[PDB]
Structure 1
Amino acid sequence: DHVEKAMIMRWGGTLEDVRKLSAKDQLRVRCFTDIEKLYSAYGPKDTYLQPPGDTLPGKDFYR
């Protein structure tokens, strides 16, 4: 349930948007979720905190 929530929220906010991806892409996303789980309180905080100047999409990307 948590894995599917992360996939839906990070890639469109809808199930159809996630299904627009390929199985390989979904595998990558799910394994990144696993990475986040394994760090949890000890991993690097750049996995969820965007450093200033980063070019990747932000929270208002789909809004």
Structure 2
Amino acid sequence: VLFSTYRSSRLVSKEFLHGPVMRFRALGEYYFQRAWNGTLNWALPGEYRLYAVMIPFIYFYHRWHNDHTLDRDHVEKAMIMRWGGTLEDVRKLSAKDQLRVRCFTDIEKLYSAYGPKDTYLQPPGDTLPGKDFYR
């Protein structure tokens, strides 16, 4: 009696936002409602242009998220640990120095397991600072 269990109990008029809804449905139907757009379990459509458009967009936004939110944490950790162990110590550097450090981190990422090991293993006799430099 308070709320109807039937979808027929309308809450708005039939003409509410008709135009924008028609534009949205036109956007949806033009490429999808076609004979050659036969989906595989609703997930893989038959239209080539759908792939061609959606794959790049998905990759783009995922990459933006990864670069500006996820890998940034590793980069900041490397900068902090290698240059004082504190955020203020890193901020004591200039922007150019931070750029150099971050690009070296990118180098390390690109090398991964297929590259020289002197980037993280100190050869004997090297004059550069060791692990106990800030301790």
d(CA) in 2 for partners of 1:26, 1:19:
9
Work out which structure has the larger RCO, using CA pairs closer than 8 Å and 6 or more positions apart in sequence: 1
CA RMSD across the alignment: 0.2
TM-score under structure 2 normalisation?
0.47
Percentage of identical aligned residues: 100
Query: 1:30-62 deviations in whole A, cap 9, x for unaligned?
Result: 000000000000110000000000000000000
Deviation at 1:16, TM superposition (A): 0.1
- Equivalents in 2 of 1:54, 1:36: separation in Å? 19
Moved over 4 A (4+): none
Whole-angstrom distance in 2 between the partners of 1:49 and 1:34: 17
Which of the pair has more CA radius of gyration? Answer: 2
The two structures have a TM-score, normalised by structure 1, of 1.00
Query: Is there any run of 5+ residues in structure 2 with no aligned partner, and where?
Result: 1-72
Q: Please state whether the residue corresponding to 1:53 is helix, strand or coil.
A: coil
Instruction: Give the deviation of 1:9 after TM superposition.
Output: 0.1
1:46 alignment partner, SS class: helix
Q: Structure 1: 5+ residue runs without aligned partners? A: none
Offset, 1:10: 0.1
Q: Map residues 1-63 of structure 1 onto 2, 5 A cutoff.
A: 1-63=73-135
